[PDB]
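#help-structures
NK: newbie question, is this the right format to request a structure? protein is Potassium channel toxin alpha-KTx 4.2
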Amino acid sequence: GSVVIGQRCYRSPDCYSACKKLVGKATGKCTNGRCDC
């Protein structure tokens, strides 16, 4: 959906190198210190 992953984050760009490896995902958003792709 939104897909929460293990990678932690302060800002949403922190998530790009992780989320972009998921089919159809790019940056995601940072929420509760986790990447929501």
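mod (FA): yep, format's fine, and the tokens are attached above. Residues 4-36 form one domain.
NK: thank you!
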